[PDB]
Amino acid sequence: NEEERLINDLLIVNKYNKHVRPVKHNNEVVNIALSLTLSNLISLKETDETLTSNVWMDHAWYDHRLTWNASEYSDISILRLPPELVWIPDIVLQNNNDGQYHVAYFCNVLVRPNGYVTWLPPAIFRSSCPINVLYFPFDWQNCSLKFTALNYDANEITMDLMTDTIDGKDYPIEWIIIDPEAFTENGEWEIIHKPAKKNIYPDKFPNGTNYQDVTFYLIIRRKPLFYVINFITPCVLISFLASLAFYLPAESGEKMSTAISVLLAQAVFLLLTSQRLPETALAVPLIGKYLMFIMSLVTGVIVNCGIVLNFHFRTPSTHVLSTRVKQIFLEKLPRILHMSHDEIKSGIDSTNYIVKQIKEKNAYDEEVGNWNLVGQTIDRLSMFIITPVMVLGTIFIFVMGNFNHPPAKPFEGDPFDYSSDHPRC
Amino acid sequence: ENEEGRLIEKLLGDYDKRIIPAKTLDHIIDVTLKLTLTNLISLNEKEEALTTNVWIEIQWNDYRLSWNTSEYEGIDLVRIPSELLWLPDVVLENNVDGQFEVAYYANVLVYNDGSMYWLPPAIYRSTCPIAVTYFPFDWQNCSLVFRSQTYNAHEVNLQLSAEEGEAVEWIHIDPEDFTENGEWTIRHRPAKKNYNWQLTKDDTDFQEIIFFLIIQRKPLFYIINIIAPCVLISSLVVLVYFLPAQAGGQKCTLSISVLLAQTIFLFLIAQKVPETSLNVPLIGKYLIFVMFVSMLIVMNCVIVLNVSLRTPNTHSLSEKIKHLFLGFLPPEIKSCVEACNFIAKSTKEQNDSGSENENWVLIGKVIDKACFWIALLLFSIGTLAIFLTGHFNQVPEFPFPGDPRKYVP
Amino acid sequence: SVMEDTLLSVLFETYNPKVRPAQTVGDKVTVRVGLTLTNLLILNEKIEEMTTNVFLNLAWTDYRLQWDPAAYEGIKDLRIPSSDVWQPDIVLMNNNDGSFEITLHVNVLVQHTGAVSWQPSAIYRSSCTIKVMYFPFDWQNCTMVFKSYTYDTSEVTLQHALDAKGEREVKEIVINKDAFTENGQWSIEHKPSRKNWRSDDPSYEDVTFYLIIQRKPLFYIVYTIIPCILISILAILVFYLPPDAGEKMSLSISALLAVTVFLLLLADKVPETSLSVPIIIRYLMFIMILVAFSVILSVVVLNLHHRSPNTHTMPNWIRQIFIETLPPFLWIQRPQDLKEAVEAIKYIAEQLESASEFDDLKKDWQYVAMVADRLFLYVFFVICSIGTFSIFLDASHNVPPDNPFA
Amino acid sequence: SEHETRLVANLLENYNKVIRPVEHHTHFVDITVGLQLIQLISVDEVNQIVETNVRLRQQWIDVRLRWNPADYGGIKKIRLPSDDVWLPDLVLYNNADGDFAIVHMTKLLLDYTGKIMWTPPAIFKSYCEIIVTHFPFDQQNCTMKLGIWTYDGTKVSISPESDRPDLSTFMESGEWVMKDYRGWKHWVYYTCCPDTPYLDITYHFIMQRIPLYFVVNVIIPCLLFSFLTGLVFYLPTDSGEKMTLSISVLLSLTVFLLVIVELIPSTSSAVPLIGKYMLFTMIFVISSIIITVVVINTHHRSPSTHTMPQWVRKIFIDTIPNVMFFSTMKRPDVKSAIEGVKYIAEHMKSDEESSNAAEEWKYVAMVIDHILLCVFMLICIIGTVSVFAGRLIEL
Amino acid sequence: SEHETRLVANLLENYNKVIRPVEHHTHFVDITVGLQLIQLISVDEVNQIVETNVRLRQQWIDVRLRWNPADYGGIKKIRLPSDDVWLPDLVLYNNADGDFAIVHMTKLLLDYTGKIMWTPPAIFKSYCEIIVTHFPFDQQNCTMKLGIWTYDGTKVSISPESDRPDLSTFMESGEWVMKDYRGWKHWVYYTCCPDTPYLDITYHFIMQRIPLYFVVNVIIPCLLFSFLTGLVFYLPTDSGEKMTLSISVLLSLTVFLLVIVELIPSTSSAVPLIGKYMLFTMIFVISSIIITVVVINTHHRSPSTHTMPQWVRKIFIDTIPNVMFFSTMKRPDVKSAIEGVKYIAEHMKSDEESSNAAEEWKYVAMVIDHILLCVFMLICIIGTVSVF
Ligand SMILES: *[C@@H]1O[C@H](CO)[C@@H](O)[C@H](O)[C@H]1NC(C)=O
Ligand SMILES: CCCCCCCCC
């Protein structure tokens, strides 16, 4: 096997030092071209603001020390060498959470006879991308993987985006590479844009490790079907049940029970919403806004049902039915709302007394009925005022949420699409 | 000048730890196992894992590490770090996680005749499939399976330890060192060498040593804090049969409320047993039974309420029903006169309607009184039967039903 | 390059990384320690642990790593793997887990004058005690204590770091605007640094970085406080309902259970220490007790309303207080056949008169109940408003001091 | 054994573990790969991750490790640390969040002919495309893709040991049933150049869930709530408990939302079967509450304000009741005194008229209740069957 | 330092870290062991594990590492990697969930006389027998048993540095208070042979829980609902709401029982007092519900089918009401027309009789309610003295 002789010549005879940059003179720069491939998007658990991703990092550089004349040895056109024997550019994900800066598996490097070295290790990265909950559950996130070279400064190694060729002209790969055949779309998120950028920070100095950067951005959109089915429509229907509290007659002593139950169910949905979100305070989530609005509205409904009940049970012995109230609630509003021989002397005196008592009782009863009608009128007015407010608020909030598409172009100030189908030039 | 230094330098110099110490081609190394349980840490039902604190005593013989005592001032025992020696890769196979090897790699005691004694401690998490059928009155049968990860029966011969010729066929528990777990009691603790006859002696899984832990749950806590409350709450359903069947009686309120309380207890029991789909826990069966009974009582309350609030307007009281349910189971003068007659007639009509309503109410009361006895009998019998079958879930008398041996020191 | 190999071979021929660099026996190594905060990940209050992502700016001088650039093609500095040189065992002392050392071992930079600089990265889980008295309207003061685990003041001298163009010491945590993610739940008000000694022990010295962080309570405001205010409104309202509606107990008990459940579903978030009771829990307890008293007085009002002369006799003091004195203050002012026929009529009339007297007494009882209900309504409106306003005003006036005191 | 010590010393003296075991660099190393599933640890439907415990049997031939037994006391096999020889870097291509390659560097068996056998254990966490359409009566098909990471088909070629994995020592899941399993080898080429294949082996397992835990913990309570919901229409309106019962059912179902949400998968690819059933139950309860409110409103209609329309009387009082077979429902001062008696009589006439009208309204309400009772029991049964039996028959 | 470089080169040239540091195999190594508690990380009651952050100071003598300062420029102390010299294998016997031995191999200080001081850190997760019988007012006594694993007392001897572990830099807990702490050395012998002692050192800390958190968050609501329990006997039966109140109290108490049971370990060694009192309160509420259902049944008793027994009338209308002092209880066709009027009068008479019977039953029910309310207040005033 000639490979043994060749590797012995390259690493032992030539005294290869894996702790020295591959440069002939110590003022040049090593160009490491790096690209990223997304094997699959695991999760974006929003509570801890973590993006867990399975990626393959493609590094490519030149090492003049690992060059050989293919004819002098047998026609060996490629070598596989473990990364613990050769110099490797330690490129680290700076914005991680769990303290895993490096690739997971250190595979072999492929070395060509001209010195070109390519290294494609896989990695599992748990990066930090803050969550914007303004439009949850109709939100889209903008997460980032920021790779830096902390072992050398920009004057010693220059990171770059990997290039590719189609028809003899080379163009940079400015996107995360996704293999359409192997990639399986995530259960909850859909990828919209995936740019890749090399960032310079001019206010820093090239003789430092915080001057360069390569950032891969994932713009993703939540598929809002789980939450529409399990959170939004049950809550909306149970909230609409509040309006029915006004169509329920006050004789059936069950208005307050209905309204209070609606409020309690809404509190349950509030609990769930709280449980499913991070503690940030940048903004109140859309579903949070809706829950606040509907809970305040249902509290108003409960208060108004209480007022209606208080009116319904008034009697002439405790309250006075003024003429103003009669005019307002029995003439105007119902029209506006389209609402639909001493023994015989003793006998005579006793029967007269009976008649007087019955007449008084009848007057009492008819005034009670008038109070009941006033209560019904207040019920109808409240229903008309409140139901449309509830319906319009719900519709407005949720259409505003449903109209929250991603901006159709990353980097607003940039007219480039960063799409794998239209490389620059 | 420590002579142990030169002795150990002589021993380890020219010693390869990758070579099994076989004197000849057909020699088989006798590897002897013993287990000392010091603390039964836990038995997690949700992940089906028993966590124990053990010392595993492994003994073998390495003919290379032998010397002559008189040559080293009577030294007859040395301690050598186990990373420098050949070890039989004895591992716990039924481990939930990937942790095969021991926790702390302690030194090995080497005696001048070659005897190697290794007593590493370990925190072992082993798979213990649970039988929830009689929860919480159940007993569990957990197993620690040890076998060599590298050598087959043609190279290493696993065996149980023996002191004074008697084989140690049990997990060793020192009364002074051991601490009882409170939630469990160790009833049986046998050990035995097992063979997988479906394989051959060249498969590394042919032989194994299995230590068994049969543990009985102490239920007093579970009783006092789950069952008595649940039974007491569920017994309230029968009370709906004494509330009046009219507005303000609140039959449905009480019935539905007891049903919801039973649901809460069901949930509490949910997060205490494995998510396996083989059997339903005993307490779960009891909760299902009481929930079904309370649903039936809700239905019966609805029916009684419907019967009691009937009127001549809607339903006609058949004579057959009435008999069955109340005999077996239990110028100006003319105007004034006309007005008086009309008043009397109307009052009598109203009173007759009221009497019919009263008869319907009585029928409702009789139905209520009968269903009370039916429901009380059903509930009491069900509760007593379920918890009596729970209380008679005794642990087997012998560790292995076939054998007559007790397997104790 | 070849010259880099030659220089490395010359430098590390007899260099022993286990030996602290001291030109002369008794010399001390001056170590400059600074911190750069890249991200303030978490401030878990359940385990009193702050997670941070940081760089440690460490600098010292090692006289052994000296060379003359003119002899090596003008190499001014080298990047040498960090495990090849001596480094001070600078560790975070007050960590919560067992991780003392850094996580990422980036290679050091050595200059021809012997100045070694090292900027390792780390995900540190420090432990800071939480002051739970104004949670969630609280500000925390979490410290990170760095010092050499092995060497003491007789071996190394800790100093602050220098700024970008080293001219003056930097006495703060450095924040790089290009690489720094705002937490979203905490805002950093002060970030000083300071060297600390101990009087009893003269061999101790450390550099501590303090983070004064103020919480943004919007999440808690919404998700706990707003429902509680609504529940308190319902509790007050219970006293406007008429006793005949038969729904006072439903409303009051529902409010009580709702607020109790809100208290229960907050132990998952509030810290578990016992040196004080957080303001949110105090507010919840206040509302819970208020609603319980609302239940009690609703029961009392119903009991008053459902009395009758067959059962009770109104004593003088209740009449004096509730029928006379209170109402004006509360604006709640208010032949044998004919002989048989005549006897029947007289009996009917007497029965009606007796019923009328009975009903008048019953109505007096009901009026007493109404007046008591109105009085309780006003009293609890006042109490709830005053208590809520006082508690939240006290919470509002809780800000970190303008002087960090460190 | 001194013989084995000398043998192992001689084998590894001039051995370089970073070179492929081939006589000539143009040849390739044939590796036989087999998978032994020992346990199916778990499946995570939300994240689509299948966690399995396996052994990864690998066999190949290393020409550099031959020896003649006669020269070493007849030794024919030895065990060597896998770290001491060349190993194929088999990688799980579709790893989800576990280790990509083998990390438990156990020992391997070596024959005197160079044949190497290596069976390391592994915990594979694979990406599993989960389909929740028929949950919990769902069948999941997902795979383990294996291949040599850094070598192409002209350098290291891998072939399956058998036509399907080995489940001889496979523990019983208790939550899944192994319906089927197989393994296939794929060649792959690229537009570059067709003389360089890239091989891999995909082992797929088809599993069927045991739907007992989910049934007894989710479906039964849903059925009980559905039954109690329709139970409200037999309760008379006079007993002030219609809304109490129905609303209690609604709140209990809302609380059950917590349990169901924490249990069922939280994906958005498709609506689970039990998701459809629960949404149906929620709509059922809400519709019952709305109709009950309407019925209650009708029962208390007063003749003073509302007059019964003719069509209502014709339908609910004359037509429908006749065709309801199941129910048993029916189908000086003397002048003042005289004037007062007349007034009492006329007032009683008016009260009788009003009472009769109100009674008619109550009768209409009761008839509506009966109709709705029948309709709602029918709808409950039909909806349950339509949701479940459609899938259950295919099983 | 050139001098220190040469010193370290000479010290480790012919040094074997596998051999005990004694000048004769018969002697023993005397190791001084001290435990310094830096922080009490946690006390997991359900799992019964105490996680503490500690430093394990160990001092001994290694005559193989001595040197003469005059020959090395006057160096009198150095720092060496602990991995380079022989270290005692000190192990925590009662480890439960952590690492048995020291895993943070920090540097150690070495004098010119051979005196080695090594103070590595550790997180000890030791088993703690939690006695939940006075929870949340309980005090815990759980320990840390340290001992040399593979060497007996005749080869390696350990002695405590001081009577008590060092808590000079202890970080105050906020959940527990250290009442006492002490360390004891134990010799152990075996029937083998009485000339081979086995030594260990057991440190123990007595921790007193601070109960404010559990009181405020658990006990106060439970007491509140227990107090509300007896209030149901003041609610009149006509309101038609007694069952609502009673059942709400029952549900609240059972929820709090759920919390309690998931707050404490499942051990059956002793019955927690909190659990016992919660069970008693649950029995109390159940009795409340049963007796109030009896009251409700009495109140609506129909006079037609039930007639008041004499004993009930006497007891509940003749004697008890006088005992309650502070209460406010009480203690042609003209013939047809005439016949109709007489019928109306007779019907009113019968209705009055039936009513009077009904109000007698209602009065009995009200008296029973007052009796039960007085009993409840008596139990309350007895309970409030128990805490004192
Ligand atoms: C051991 O050593 C002694 C004295 O050194 C010697 O007499 C004896 O032969 C040796 N061998 C045995 C087996 O004792
Ligand atoms: C002769 C007059 C009789 C009046 C009867 C009034 C009945 C009211 C209940």
**Across D62-89, where does the E strand assignment appear?**
77-81
Give how far the C-alpha of residue E144 lies from the chain's centroid of Cα atoms, to the nearest Å: 20
Rg (alpha carbons) of chain D, rounded to whole number: 39
Count CB atoms within 10 A of the CB of residue E152: 16
Contacts with B127 from chain D: Cβ below 8 Å: 171
Place of tokens 């901006």: A407
Cis before A137 (ω within 30): yes
Tokens of B177: 């060192």
The breaks in chain D (C to N more than 2.5 Å) occur after 331
Residue C128's identity, in one-letter code, is C
Contact D247 A244 (CB under 8 A): no
Residues of C in contact with E80 (CB under 8 A): 18
For ligand 1, pick from B7, B68, B112 the residue to mutate: most ligand atoms within 8 Å of CB.
Answer: B68
Contact B183 E97 (CB under 8 A): no
List, in sequence order, every beta strand (DSSP E) within C12-49: 29-42
Q: How far apart are CA A51 and CA A41, in angstroms?
A: 8
CA distances from A44 to A129, A132, A411, C43, E50 (A): 9, 12, 22, 20, 34
B74 burial level (CB within 10 Å; 0-12, 13-18, 19+): exposed
Task: Report the residue of chain B nearest E288, measured CA to CA.
Answer: B236
Residue type, B51: T
Interface contact E101-B183, CB threshold 8 A: no
How far, in Å, CA of C217 to CA of A278, rounded?
Answer: 12
Closest C-alpha to B42, from B120, B128, B101: B128
> Can you give the C-alpha Rg of chain E in angstroms?
39
CB contacts of C122 in chain A (<8 Å) are 99
The closest alpha carbon to B215, from B138, B110, B282, B115, belongs to B138
Does the beta carbon of A354 sit less than 6 angstroms from any atom of ligand 2?
A: yes
Strands A51-62 and A122-127: antiparallel
- Which helix H or strand E contains A190, and what residues bound it? strand A189-193
Q: For residue E136, say if its preceding peptide bond is cis, omega within 30 degrees of 0.
A: yes
Distance CA(A331)–CA(A315), nearest Å, equals 20
Q: Which of D129, D294, D337 sits opposite A184 (nearest CB)?
A: D129
Whole-number Å distance between alpha carbons of A343 and C223: 78
List all residues 6 or more positions away from D263 whose beta carbon is below 8 Å from its beta carbon: D214, D217, D218
- Identify the closest residue of chain D to A189 by CA–CA distance: D268
Residues 6+ apart with CB under 8 A from D255: A268, B263
Mutate to test the interface with E, among C19, C204, C275 (most CBs of E within 10 A): C19
In eight-state DSSP terms, residue A403 is: T
Ligand 1 lined by B352 (C-beta under 6 Å): no
- The closest alpha carbon to E52, from E186, E179, E207, belongs to E207
Give the number of other CB atoms < 10 A from CB of residue C372. 20
Nearest residue to A152 via CA among A206, A100, A216? A206
Cβ burial of A233 (10 Å; 0-12, 13-18, 19+) is middle
Backbone angles phi, psi at E188, to 5 degrees: -130, 135
- Residue A159 near residue A32 (C-beta atoms within 8 A): yes
Ligand 2 centroid from CA C354, angstroms: 15
Q: How far is CA A178 from CA A173, B9, E299, in A?
A: 12, 59, 78
- Which ligand 1 atom is the nearest neighbour of the CA of B71? 5
- Taking the CB of residue C172, how many other CB atoms lie within 10 A of it? 17
Residues found in chain E? 388
What DSSP line would sit under E261-307, residue for residue? HHHS----SS--HHHHHHHHHHHHHHHHHHHHHHHHHHHT--TTT--
Dmax over CA atoms of chain A, in Å, equals 156
Token pair for residue A292? 């606040």
Q: What's the per-residue H, E or C state across chain B?
A: CCHHHHHHHHHHCCCCCCCCCCCCCCCCEEEEEEEEEEEEEEEECCCCEEEEEEEEEEEEECCCCCCCHHHHCCCCEEEEEHHHCCCCCEEECCECCCCCCCCCCCEEEEECCCEEEECCEEEEEEECCCCHHHCCCCEEEEEEEEEECCCCCCCEEEEECEECCEECCECECCCCCCCCCCCEEEEECEEEEEECCCCCCCCCCCEEEEEEEEEEECCHHHHHHHHHHHHHHHHHHHHHHHCCCCCCCCHHHHHHHHHHHHHHHHHHHHCCCCCCCCCCCHHHHHHHHHHHHHHHHHHHHHHHHHHHCCCCCCECCCHHHHHHHHHHCCCHHHHHHHHHHHHHHHHHHHHHHHHHHHHHHHHHHHHHHHHHHHHHHHHHHHHHHHHHHHHCCCCCCCCCCCCCCCCCC
Is the Cβ of C304 closer than 8 Å to some Cβ of chain A?
Answer: no
Looking at the partner chain, which of B81, B220, B347 has a beta carbon nearest the beta carbon of E268?
A: B220
Give backbone dihedrals phi and psi of E384, rounded to 5 degrees, phi first: -65, -20
The answer, yes or no, to whether any atom of ligand 2 lies below 6 A from the CB of E258, is: no
Q: Which residue has the tokens 């009026």?
A: C367
Phi-psi region of C169 (alpha: psi -120 to 50; beta: other; left: phi over 0): beta
Distance of CA D227 to the CA centre of its chain: 25
The nearest CA of chain B is from the CA of D386 a distance in Å of 25
Mutate to test the interface with C, among A256, A274, A302, A351 (most CBs of C within 10 A): A256
Contact C23, C161 (CB under 8 A): no
Write out residues 307-366 of C within 8 Å (CB-CB) of E.
307, 309-315, 337-338, 340-341, 343-345, 347-348, 351
Q: Residue A245's closest CA among A312, A170, A298, A169?
A: A298
Atom of ligand 2 nearest to the CA of C345: 1
Which amino acid does the sequence have at E9?
A: A
Per DSSP, what are the bridge partners of residue E81? Answer: E107
User: Of the candidates C173, C175, C170, C150, which has an alpha carbon nearest to the alpha carbon of residue C160?
Assistant: C170
Tokens of C236: 């007050």
Residue nearest to atom 6 of ligand 1 (CA): B70
Domains, chain E, in order of start with CATH, read 2-212 (2.70.170.10), 213-387 (1.20.58.390)
Q: CB C389: neighbour CB atoms within 10 A?
A: 10
- Give kind and range of the element (H or E) at residue C146: strand C139-148
One-letter amino acid for residue A231 of the chain: F
Give the Cα separation of D312 and D363 in Å (integer).
Answer: 11
Strand order in the sheet with E193-209: E90-92, E139-148, E193-209, E176-190
Phi, psi of B254 (to 5 degrees): -60, -45
C-alpha distances (whole Å) from E196 to each of B55, E88, E118, E149 are 21, 18, 27, 14
SS3 assignment, position D53: strand
CA C143 to chain centre: 17
How many angstroms separate the CA atoms of E106 and E245, rounded?
65
DSSP state of A15: T
Alpha helices in chain D (DSSP H): 2-11, 213-214, 220-230, 242-263, 273-299, 310-313, 333-394
Residue keyed to tokens 């997304």: A38
Quote the tokens at residue E65.
């590492």
What does R_g of chain C's alpha carbons equal in angstroms?
39
Q: Are D94 and D126 in contact (CB under 8 A)?
A: yes
* Cβ-based contacts under 8 A for chains B and D: 157
Q: Which residues pair with E79 in a beta bridge?
A: E109
The single residue listed with the structure tokens 């219609």 is: D242
Please count the other Cβ atoms lying within 10 Å of the Cβ belonging to residue E166: 17
Q: Could you give the 3-state DSSP secondary structure of residue D62?
A: coil
Residue C315 CB neighbour total at 10 angstroms: 9
Among residues B1, B5, B11, B24, which one has the least CA distance to residue B68?
Answer: B11
Closest CA of chain B from D190, distance in Å: 38
Q: Is B113 in the pocket of ligand 1 (CB under 6 A)?
A: no
Q: Which of B7, B10, B67, B71 to mutate to test the pocket of ligand 1 (most atoms within 8 A of CB)?
A: B71
A-D contacts (CB, under 8 Å): 185
- Cβ–Cβ under 8 Å, residues E50 and E42: yes
3-state secondary structure of D157: strand
Task: Yes or no: say if E338 and C340 are a contact pair by the CB < 8 Å rule.
Answer: yes
CA of B247 to the centre of ligand 2 (A): 29
Annotation: CATH topology of B3-220:
Acetylcholine Binding Protein; Chain: A, (2.70.170)
Is the separation of the CB atoms in B3 and B73 below 8 Å?
yes
The tokens describing D250, both together, are 């609604």
Instruction: Output the CA torsion sign for D240, D246, D249, D255.
Output: negative
**Residue E88 token pair:** 């005692």
Q: Which ligand lies nearest to the CA atom of residue A355 in the structure?
A: 2
Let me know how long chain B is: 409
Beta strand D107-111 pairing with D115-118? antiparallel
In angstroms, the CA E41 to CA E62 distance is: 35
Place of tokens 């003469």: E68
Q: Measure B246 CA to nearest chain E CA, in Å.
A: 10
The answer to whether the beta carbons of residues E31 and E60 sit under 8 Å apart is: yes
Residue whose CA is at the smallest distance from ligand 2 atom 3:
E341
Resolution (A): 2.9
Tell me which residue has tokens 């088809």: D206
Which residues lie closer than 8 Å to A79 by C-beta, 6 or more apart?
Answer: A3, A6, A7, A66, A110, A111
Task: Report residue A375 CA to chain centroid gap.
Answer: 46
Whether D73 has its CB under 8 Å from any CB of chain B: the answer is yes
Q: Across chain C, which distance is largest between two alpha carbons, in Å? A: 154
CA E239 – CA B248 distance, rounded (Å): 7
Residue D220 CB coordination number (10 Å) = 13
Pick from A183, A3, A175, A87: nearest CA to D151: A3
Write down the residue that tokens 């949910």 correspond to.
B270
Q: Give me B49's structure tokens.
A: 């894992």
Q: How far is the CA of B84 from the centre of ligand 1 (A)?
A: 27
Q: Measured between beta carbons, which residues in chain E are less than 8 angstroms from residue B2?
A: 19-20, 22-25
Question: How many helices and strands, by DSSP H and E, does chain E display?
Answer: 8, 11
Looking at the partner chain, which of A90, A146, A282 has a beta carbon nearest the beta carbon of C184? Answer: A282
Please tell me the distance from the alpha carbon of residue B207 to that of residue B191, in angstroms, as a whole number: 14
Q: Whose Cα sits closest to atom 11 in ligand 1?
A: B68
Bridge partners (DSSP) listed for residue A127: A51, A96
